[PDB]
Structures are given as structure tokens and as C-alpha cells.
Amino acid sequence: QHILRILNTNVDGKEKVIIALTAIKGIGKRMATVICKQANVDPTKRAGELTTEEIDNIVHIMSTPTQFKIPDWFLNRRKDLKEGKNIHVIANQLDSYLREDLERMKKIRLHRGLRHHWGLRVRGQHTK
Amino acid sequence: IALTSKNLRAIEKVCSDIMKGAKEKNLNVSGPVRLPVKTLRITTRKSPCGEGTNTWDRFELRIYKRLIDLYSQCEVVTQMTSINIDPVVEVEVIITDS
Amino acid sequence: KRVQTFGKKKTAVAVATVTNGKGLIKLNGKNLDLVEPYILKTKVYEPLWLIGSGKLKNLDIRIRVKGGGQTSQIYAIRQAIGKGIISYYQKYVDESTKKELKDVLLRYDRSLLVGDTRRCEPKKFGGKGARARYQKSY
Amino acid sequence: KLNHAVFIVITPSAIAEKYKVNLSVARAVINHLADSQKLYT
Amino acid sequence: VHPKKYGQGSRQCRVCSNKHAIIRKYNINICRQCFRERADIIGFKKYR
Amino acid sequence: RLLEPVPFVKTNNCIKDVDADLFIRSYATHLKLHNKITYPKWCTFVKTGKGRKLAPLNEDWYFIRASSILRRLYLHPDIGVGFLRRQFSSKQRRGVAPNHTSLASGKILRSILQQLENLGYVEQNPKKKGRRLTTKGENAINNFARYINKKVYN
Amino acid sequence: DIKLFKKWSYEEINIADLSLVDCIAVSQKACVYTPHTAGRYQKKRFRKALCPIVERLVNSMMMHGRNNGKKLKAIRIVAYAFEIIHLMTGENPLQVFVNAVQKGGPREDSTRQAVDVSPLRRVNQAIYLICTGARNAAFRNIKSISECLAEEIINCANESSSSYAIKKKDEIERVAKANR
RNA sequence: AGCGGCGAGUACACUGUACUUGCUGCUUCUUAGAGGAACAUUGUGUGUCUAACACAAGGAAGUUUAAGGCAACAACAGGUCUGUGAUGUCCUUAGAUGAACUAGGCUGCACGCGUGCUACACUGAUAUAUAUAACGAGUAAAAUAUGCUUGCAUACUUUUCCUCCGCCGAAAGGCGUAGGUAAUCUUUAUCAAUAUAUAUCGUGAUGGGGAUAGAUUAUUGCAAUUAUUAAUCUUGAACGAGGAAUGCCUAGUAAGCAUGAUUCAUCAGAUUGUGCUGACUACGUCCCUGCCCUUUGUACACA
């Protein structure tokens, strides 16, 4: 019933089924909610009766949702100026692509990049 | 016929003259209009320099205007006004029929 | 037949007009029941018990309530209806019962008949607070 | 640290203190038995 | 020159000819320093 | 519970005489039953307001909003998108900077009013520029209010 | 006639010590359905005591950080506390809360020697100690502040050791014993 | 601006009601011109029965009903000659110490101190909506065409404030018009927030909380890089009520909550006003601190 553990923590078995997929990642509670509404999982039930069918539905849903009805403007770092368009890539791949995004800035090495590399706020933390 | 000024005594005396003349000419006159006061207030800092306690002061200008209507000749009403009005008061004219 | 009265207290001003009817009491397009606060509904209701619903069964009082906080509106409508009923008693229906009407209203309180002049003062200088100023640093 | 659940005088706090349960599951059980805060019946 | 009808450079005090502390309040287009002494003749009387 | 002993003589000739809070729920229930309007599916991924910052998490917020809109149309018959946004304005927190009031999104209200116009419950005219209720809608809402009154009374 | 929250008219009131009754000053003039009235207390000294005891409770519960001044939800919290109290123990919530206030106030305080406590500030200090207990019970005690304040009230009324107000009174009397 | 009356009613009662159309029996009500009203007023008291003070009552008005401003004499060698074509003296002017123009700074930071802004939740995090006020504040430029060859010159209306509305856009914002130089249009038969009642959650550094990033989209401005401003998604610190120290404050006011105005092309986290919710505790004391009076001692008098 309770305690189902996946790639990310889902110890919210005693908590709600919606929090079961909003606490795993996307703590902004908006990407998680759109994933939930594409899952068509009711919020009345709790997370203690989650089905591996629903989990696999999620693992099929987040897989490049651009084909789905989620708008372009919603998605994370949409343009990310290149030959194509990037997308939110959840948890582990999220952090891998963020590692890409802050490794592509060290060769830009502009004012903001060197300022952050020296340890100063992008807009200025005003320690003065 | 609407008048406007900033002090109350001038508008009082000219309105008194206006309705006295209206009673004299026994013409169709609408009732007096007694508008709520409209005040202009600004607040400015004292102490021309940058030194000392920060002290401000406030101002006020109470603007007074009223309306009336009369059924008479425009020329004669403008003459009887301009005879006994102080140029410090601004008056405009609108005629009425019934 | 018809008489108009007013109640002014706090920020809100309420106006009433008591006419001959069958007990139709209206608050703008609504009634006295759909204000929301059931706590202040009985505050408005207190004159009904103080005087009587059977006599309100022959008088229609229209009410216009507009402006100010909800508590101020309740207090203003109380004042307006009290003054309207006292005037209608003094004018049309009966005076002998009005003698006891004032005796009972004033026995309950002085607040229903006349409102209060309590209002905010011009906030002073020095700082954010009205009587408090910015923190002093030596 | 929360450990209460739904698995084992009808008001929420009373039922919660009786059965050592969360307030939400307590309200759920209350509706189950009978069938924001309101005056009691 | 690089003049413009925008910003603080488009107007200044009509007496001191300075761009500092100029009030547009009711289009007086005046500085506070001179206004605080011209107030009485202008009609600005400190009351309360 | 919500009922109270009425001490005066009522009229109950229109919808303001009935409680608005439950009348909007009753209209939402009727709207879902008869499926007069769509959802619509287009808005299922947009927050109601900028400062809301959260999903309505009810799945019926369009019906709720439409019931509210009709209550507004009756209670004051000269509205607009600006007036509606002002009434639906909520707080918005700018992080460190202090919280400020902010209006709701206008597209949702425009879609709702267009749906109501297509349903014909509300119309437009140069005179009385705001959205107004038609005569057929007036009589229909009168009878609906009387039905709700009778249902909750006897 | 008048019934608090449309529930209690408190037609019976315990005699207390004949001074707390005037201190709370609850009567037909002070009767109300919900807290947060419009009574004044800063035109005199007696009016401050004339404010009802439940009003003082609701307007003293509000002090903790950001929560300051939220006396509408002070109304809510005291209403919920009354509701839960009335059937956690059969006694009238107002009455049991009254006995709690009665026995939760220190009577002699040794600030600078010892001084007997006036009834007014005995009531005020009982309320203050109850408020502090409820705040430290909203501090990291799992359960809601409703149950926290209700438990504090019933504990003060039945004179049990788990009450922070009684513990603070014991501390004050221990200082009194040490000085004297 | 309000009150009505009837002219036709839209649905209900029965022998007026919510929403609309227009004129005018009338002006307490929406309001201000003026004046009056509150003077320890009347008695039961305290007082050398003189000056002073209490109770109770009418009354909106009994601490001057309260809050606002004017602040004597003398002084500081207090601040300002960077507000002034107010100003003496000294200094300078072609490599200007006059003016304009490009770019750059006070926005950077081991730290410190303030002014201040947002948290530690369930008295709250969250979604619905009714009941909401007042001070407020508001009108030498666009584009079109022609000529030369998008740019230059010229002729035409008014774009250059608040803006409602109807559309486009999640939003930001964009497009075209009603109105107002203003109790008339924003908006005012009514604009914020603390609400509200029902609902998800039911104190688990939690979902609180938001320090924290990139990606951007639109506006303001010729110019936003030093991410001005700005909606969107991702980012997830301290914080369990608070060190030595130390600040402010007595009634529609403390505090919380917002909001108008100033500077403003754009930018409040600044200042000033306005209002809501309307609290724990006085009719005092000189203990600290700081003043005032008298006596007293001084070898101090730039005290």
C-alpha cells in the first residue's frame, strides 16, 4: 500500500496522490500539475493506491511532451538558442542538461559569467 | 452662469448682487448651486540644505465655484455682471428657455 | 403615507423611507438577510424585538445603503430605521405608543438613536506611525 | 512527525483524539458514519 | 548637440535655471527652494 | 443551518432575493447537467491570475467562474473586462519586494463572456455599453431563482 | 435571549473569588456572538476591565511573528476551541475556561520583597501565561493550536502539572520562597 | 446630486417588489455659504471657600471635544556661497574652471551601522465570492501624401493625460474607438488588503518560506551590455520566535494590512498623505536618561 520508492523520493504515501507526483520534481508545482492533468489522475485519492500503470503513464507522458498539448511558452528554457528547441528533462536529465547549460557559459565568459564564477550576484547582491 | 474663484467673500458678494438683480428683473431664475469644496494640497520639505531634522510643511487652496441660470438677454446680463464683478472672479454664461 | 429619514455614523451613510404597505423591507436590491454577517443581522434585528413585528406588518420601509465598511453600514442602517420609525410614529400612525417607543429605545441604549463622531485623525509627521516615528540611531 | 492514517461525539477533533488519526481522514470517517467549520447538529 | 523632449533634460526651474528638485505638480515647473518662499504670493498658504 | 427566521415580508421576485453563494453553485450544477457550455479544453493549462501562482485544482473552476459572471451581470448590468478583472483582482507576491494587488487574466473572462454571448444569455449594444441580460434570460433566471427558492424553502 | 455564537448564554457563572467576576465584566452589555467587538477601553481605567474576558483572550492570542493582528482568525480559533472543548469535556467551554483563568493567576509576586497582585493584573497575567503556553505549544508540538489552547485551558481548569501557566506560577512562588 | 410622482412595462402577489424610458410637486437626504450649538453647563463633593480638582446627568461635543500651525529673548563661530544674475575676498579662462558631444560612476565588496523590504506557518500555505471606503490624479509632437532617391524638404488632422469598451495575446502587452481641461469619463449605485463561508492541506525545514540561476517574451527610452521594467518554466539558503547591545509607541490611535501623491520617458524596497481590522496594559513616578526652579560649594568662565 504505502512506501513506493522510485528514481526520486515518493515517501509521500501518507500524503496526497497529487503531491506524490508534485514532490518528486518540478517543485514549482506547475509542470507537475500539467503532467498530472495529462495523466488524468484524480486528486481525491491518496498516494497509497498508486498503480505502476499510472507510473508508466507518467514515464510515457514526460517523454518529450512537445507532441502533447502543453504549449511552447509553458515549457522550460524553450528557445535555448541553438539549431533546435530544448525542453524540461526532469530530475537526473534535468541536472545533466543544466550542467550542459553552465558549461556552455564558461566559453561565453562574459561579464555575468565571470562575475558568478568569482562569486558575485548576477544583478548584484549589494553586500555594501 | 457659473462663477469661480478661491476666496469666499468675493463669490458671496457677487452672488448676492446676482440674485438681487434677478429679483429686480423678475425673470425665470434657477436655484443656487452649492458645490462641495475642492482643495489643492502640496507638501514640501523645509531646510534648503541637507542638514538638520527632516521637516516638511503642507499647503491648501480651497477653490470655490457655483452655478446659476437666468432667462434674460445675454448682452444685458453680461453688462450687469461686468459692471459689478471683480476681475479676480471668472464667470461663464449659459442661457435657459423653459 | 411616506417619509424619508437618514442615519449617519462612522464612514457609512444609510437612508430609509417608510411608507404604507404590508412589511416590505428592502436593502438596495437585496434584503436585510443577505448582507452576510449573521452577527450584525441580529444587531439590526434588535429594534424589531424592541418595537414589534406586528406593527411593521403594516409599514413598508425601503432602504438605500451605500459606502463605508460593513460594520459602519450596519450601524448606519440601524440609525436610519430608528429615526424613520420614530418619525412615522410622530407623524402618521400613533404618538402614545411613541412615548414608550423612545423610552424603550433609550432604555436599551443611546447608540441606536444617534451615531458616533469617531473617525480617523490626520496622520502626523515623523515616520510611518501616526504617533510613532522612524527608529533613532545614535 | 506524522504517522496517523485512516485504518483503525462525531466532531473532527473528538474523533481525531479518539482514534489517533489525521483531521482529514477523521472528517472522511465522520462523513462515512453520518451518511469551513460548521455548527454541530 | 543631443537634445530631446524626454527625461530631466527637457525642463528645469524657471528661476534658478537648475534641473534639481523640480516639481511638475500642477505644472508649476518650479524648484522647491524658490517655491517655499514664492508660496505666499502664489497663493500657497500653509494652514494645517 | 444557513436558513434564518425571516421577520419581514419578502418578495422573492428575482434572483437577488435568494442567496448568491448557493445560487451560483446551483447554476453550476445545472450547467454541468445540461452541458450548455464547453469546458473549454483550451484553458486547462493557464492560471486564472498572475498573482494566483497555483492551479485552481478543482476541475470545475470554469463553471464556478461562469456562475459568478452571471451573478455579476444581474447584480450590476453594466460591466466590462476591466471591471471584471478589478473585481477578480488578487494579491501578488514579488518575492523580497512587498506584495501588491494585481488583476486577473483577461483571456479567460473574454472567453467566458463570448461563450455566454453564444448561449444568448448576455447581449451587447452601444447604448448600455456593458454586457446586459436579455429579456428571455431575465425571465429564465427569474423562474430559476423562484425554483431554487422553493427547493430550499419547502 | 443573547447566546454566544448562538450557542451559550452562560446564564450560570461560578462565583470565583468575587473579584474576577468584575474583572471579566461579562454581562448583557458585554454579550456578543463572535469576538473582536468595537468596545473602547482607552477613555478610562474601568472600561479596560469592562472588556469581556473572551475578548481579551482573542485579542491576546494573536502575538506570534507574522500572525500578529489576525483577530478574525482569533475569532475562528476560539470558536473551534469552544466547539472541541464542549464535548471533550461536558462542561460549558466558557465556564471551564473561567475556572482555568481563576486558578491560573499568580497571587503574590516577589519582584523587588513581595507584592500582592491586584485582581486586574492577576487576570491579565493569567491570560498572558495561557497565551505563552499556547504559543510554545504551537511550537513543535505536532498537534494544532486549537487542541493546544484547549488542552491548556482544561489543564489550567483541572490544575494539572503539564500546564505552562501553572509551571510559571510555581517558578514565581519558588522565587518568593527563596527571597522569603 | 438626491427625493419622488406617472408613461410603458419585463416576472412575482392580491381587494407594491428587482430591472429598465423620459419630464417635472420638492431639496433633510450627495453637499456646503453662513450661523448657532460646549461656557466646569446643572446639582452631590474635594479646596485657604479665592485660584484648583471629582462624581452623575442631558448632549455628537465635559482630558481646551480632540488632531493639525504660527514658537519670544539669546546663542551655535551648527548646515548651506553646489538654489539663485543673494553675496565680498582670492583664483581661472583656448590645452577654459563657459557650453556641447562619445564612453565610463556613485548599482562593484572582507566587513559595520542604521534607515527599510520578504520568512519561520495551522492564530496558517491554497481555490472560490459576496460587504466594501477616503485624500486622491488626470489632455512645440505622430502619422499621410508629393518631389528627389527605406532617407531628405514641403502641405494636410491632431497623436503627445487619465482612459472605458470591443477585439488579439497565458501574461507582459498590442490594435480602434465612447468620455472627460474633469462631483459629468477612469469611477465612484463604487477601485486595495486584513476578510468572508465552504472547501485541498492539518505544523511532516512540510506543500511553509523564498536568498538563488538560465532561458525568454513585451513595453519605456536613439541607446536596458551592468540581465532598467516586465508575464512564463526550471532554481530551493537562512528561518523552530531569536547574542553583547539597542530603537519607537497611550485611542478609531500601537501593530498588521494595503493604497493615493512626490520625484517619473521607465524604475519604490524612499518620503508624505489616506483608509480597513480597531489590541495585552495608566488617570500615575522620578529609579536611569534628559530638562526646569530654589539653596549651597567652587581654585571653572572657550565655563
Domains and CATH numbers, chain B: 1-98 (3.30.70.600)
Provide DSSP, G35-83. S------SS-SHHHHHS-HHHHHHHHTT-SGGGTT-HHHHHHHHHHHHH
Is the domain of A18 the same as that of A49?
A: yes
Q: Which residues contact C129 (CB under 8 A, 6 or more apart)?
A: none
Residue owning grid cell 436599551: C108
Residue owning grid cell 473582536: G36
Q: Is the CB of C83 under 7 A from strand H?
A: no
Residues of D in Cβ contact (< 8 Å) with G150 = 13
Instruction: Cell numbers for D33, please give them.
Output: 458514519
Distance CA G115, CA A51 (A): 69
Residue type, F55: A
Distance CA B66, CA B35 (A): 6
Q: Give yes or no for a contact between C81 and C48, defined as CB atoms under 8 angstroms apart.
A: no
Distance CA B64, CA C126 (A): 33
Is the domain of A84 the same as that of A101?
A: yes
Question: How many alpha carbons lie under 13 Å from residue D8 in its C-beta half-sphere?
Answer: 3
Single out the residue of G166, G146, G169, G144 nearest to residue G157, CA to CA: G166
Distance CA G115, CA B46 (A): 53
Is the domain of A50 the same as that of A63?
A: yes
Residue owning grid cell 498572558: G128
Instruction: Cell numbers for G149, please give them.
Output: 489552547
Task: Give backbone dihedrals phi and psi of B60, rounded to 5 degrees, phi first.
Answer: -155, 140
Cα F34 from chain centroid (whole Å):
17
- Name the residues in F60-99 having a C-beta closer than 7 Å to nucleic acid strand H: 61, 64-65, 68, 71-72, 75-77, 79-84, 86-99
- Helices and strands (H and E) in chain G: how many: 8, 2
Q: Is the CB of G111 under 7 A from strand H?
A: no
Is the domain of A9 the same as that of A42?
A: yes
Between CA B6 and CA B15, with CA B9 as vertex, the angle to 5 degrees is: 95
Q: Is the CB of A15 under 7 A from strand H?
A: yes
Is the domain of A46 the same as that of A15?
A: yes
- Å from A128 (CA) to H52 (C1')? 61
Q: Give yes or no for a contact between C48 and F6, defined as CB atoms under 8 angstroms apart.
A: no
**F133 C-beta neighbours (distance < 10 Å), count:** 17
Residues of E in Cβ contact (< 8 Å) with B58 = 46-48
Q: Give yes or no for a contact between B51 and B19, defined as CB atoms under 8 angstroms apart.
A: no
Print the domain residue range for G25. 1-180
Sign, Cα dihedral of G153, G156, G157, G161? positive
Task: Give backbone dihedrals phi and psi of G55, rounded to 5 degrees, phi first.
Answer: -60, -45
DSSP bridge partners of B62: B39
Q: In chain E, at which residue ranges do the beta strands (DSSP E only) sit?
A: 22-23, 30-31
Distance CA B42, CA B60 (A): 7
**G44 C-beta neighbours (distance < 10 Å), count:** 10
B38-40 and B90-92: which strand pairing? unpaired
**Angstrom distances, CA of residue C120 to CA of B60, C68, C84, G37, G48:** 20, 13, 28, 18, 21
- Helices and strands (H and E) in chain D: how many: 2, 0
Q: Give yes or no for a contact between C18 and C68, defined as CB atoms under 8 angstroms apart.
A: no
Task: Categorise residue F127: left if φ over 0, alpha if ψ from -120 to 50, beta otherwise.
Answer: beta
Sign, Cα dihedral of G139, G144, G146, G148? negative
Q: Give yes or no for a contact between D29 and D19, defined as CB atoms under 8 angstroms apart.
A: yes
Task: Give backbone dihedrals phi and psi of C80, rounded to 5 degrees, phi first.
Answer: -65, -45
Q: Give yes or no for a contact between G96 and G153, defined as CB atoms under 8 angstroms apart.
A: yes
Q: Which residues contact C92 (CB under 8 A, 6 or more apart)?
A: C1, C3, C20
Residues of G in Cβ contact (< 8 Å) with D10 = none
Is the domain of A83 the same as that of A115?
A: yes
Distance CA F16, CA C34 (A): 9
**A39 C-beta neighbours (distance < 10 Å), count:** 16
Q: Is the CB of F21 under 7 A from strand H?
A: yes
- Give the DSSP H/E element, type plus range, for residue D29: helix D23-34
- Give the DSSP H/E element, type plus range, for residue F101: strand F97-102
Single out the residue of B27, B25, B23, B14 nearest to residue B95, CA to CA: B27
Single out the residue of C9, C89, C11 nearest to residue C43, CA to CA: C9
Method: cryo-EM
Residue owning grid cell 454579550: G31
- Give the DSSP H/E element, type plus range, for residue F27: helix F20-34
Instruction: Cell numbers for A16, please give them.
Output: 496526497
Cis ω for the linkage preceding F40 (within 30 of 0): yes
Single out the residue of G158, G137, G157 nearest to residue G148, CA to CA: G137
**Angstrom distances, CA of residue G135 to CA of F87, G125, G160:** 37, 15, 19
Print the domain residue range for A55. 1-71
Whether G73 and chain D come into contact, CB under 8 Å, resolves to no
Distance CA C44, CA C31 (A): 12
Where does residue A57 rank: exposed (0-12), middle (13-18), buried (19+ CB within 10 A)? middle
Catalogue all structural domains in chain F, each as residue range(s) with its CATH number.
1-154 (1.10.10.10)
Print the domain residue range for D32. 1-41
Q: Give yes or no for a contact between A74 and F55, defined as CB atoms under 8 angstroms apart.
A: no
Distance CA G54, CA G38 (A): 14
Single out the residue of F125, F116, F128, F130 nearest to residue F27, CA to CA: F116
Instruction: Cell numbers for F60, please give them.
Output: 470545475
- Å from E27 (CA) to H146 (C1')? 40
- Name the residues in C107-126 having a C-beta closer than 7 Å to nucleic acid strand H: 110, 113-114, 116-126
- Give the DSSP H/E element, type plus range, for residue A92: helix A91-103
Distance CA C18, CA C24 (A): 10
Please measure the distance between the N-terminal and C-terminal CA atoms of chain G and give it in whole angstroms: 51
Q: Give yes or no for a contact between C28 and C136, defined as CB atoms under 8 angstroms apart.
A: no
Distance CA G46, CA F62 (A): 55
> E1-48 adopts what CATH topology?
30s Ribosomal Protein S14; Chain N (4.10.830)
Show the DSSP H helices in chain C as ranges.
Answer: 38-51, 53-56, 70-91, 96-108
CATH code of residue G62: 1.10.455.10
What SS3 state is found at D18?
Answer: helix
Where does residue A54 rank: exposed (0-12), middle (13-18), buried (19+ CB within 10 A)? middle
Distance CA B97, CA B79 (A): 20
Q: Is the CB of C26 under 7 A from strand H?
A: yes
Q: Which residues of C5-38 are buried (b: 16+ CB within 10 A; e: fewer)?
A: bebbbbebbbbbbbbeeebbbbbeebbbbbbeee
Distance CA G123, CA G116 (A): 13
Between CA F58 and CA F62, with CA F59 as vertex, the angle to 5 degrees is: 105
DSSP bridge partners of B55: none
Distance CA C102, CA C99 (A): 6
How is chain E split into domains, by residue range?
Answer: 1-48
Single out the residue of C69, C98, C63 nearest to residue C9, CA to CA: C69
Work out how many domains chain A is built from and give that number.
2
Task: Give backbone dihedrals phi and psi of G25, rounded to 5 degrees, phi first.
Answer: 55, 40
Residue owning grid cell 467562474: F65
- Rounded to 10 degrees, what is the CA torsion of A58, A60, A64, A66? -80
What SS3 state is found at G89?
Answer: coil
Distance CA B85, CA B14 (A): 6
Between CA A56 and CA A62, with CA A57 as vertex, the angle to 5 degrees is: 100
Single out the residue of G14, G10, G23 nearest to residue G125, CA to CA: G23
Q: Give yes or no for a contact between D30 and D38, defined as CB atoms under 8 angstroms apart.
A: no
Residue type, D2: L
Instruction: Cell numbers for G122, please give them.
Output: 492577576
Residue type, G9: S
Distance CA G30, CA G46 (A): 14
Is the domain of A58 the same as that of A85?
A: no
Work out how many domains chain G is built from and give that number.
1
Distance CA C15, CA C9 (A): 12
Cα G66 from chain centroid (whole Å):
22
Residue type, G164: Y
Q: Give yes or no for a contact between G34 and G5, defined as CB atoms under 8 angstroms apart.
A: yes
Distance CA A116, CA A109 (A): 10
Sign, Cα dihedral of G88, G89, G95, G96? negative
Whether A74 and chain F come into contact, CB under 8 Å, resolves to yes
**B30 C-beta neighbours (distance < 10 Å), count:** 13
Instruction: Cell numbers for B3, please give them.
Output: 462663477
Is the domain of A95 the same as that of A66?
A: no
Q: Which residues contact F31 (CB under 8 A, 6 or more apart)?
A: F37, F63, F66, F67
Catalogue all structural domains in chain C, each as residue range(s) with its CATH number.
1-138 (3.30.230.10)
Q: HEC states along B68-89?
A: CCECCCHHHHHHHHHHHCCCCC
- What C97-105 contacts at long range (C-beta under 8 Å, 24+ apart), as own/partner pairs, is C101/C51, C104/C50, C104/C51, C105/C47, C105/C50
Single out the residue of A55, A44, A40 nearest to residue A6, CA to CA: A55
Largest CA distance in chain F: 54
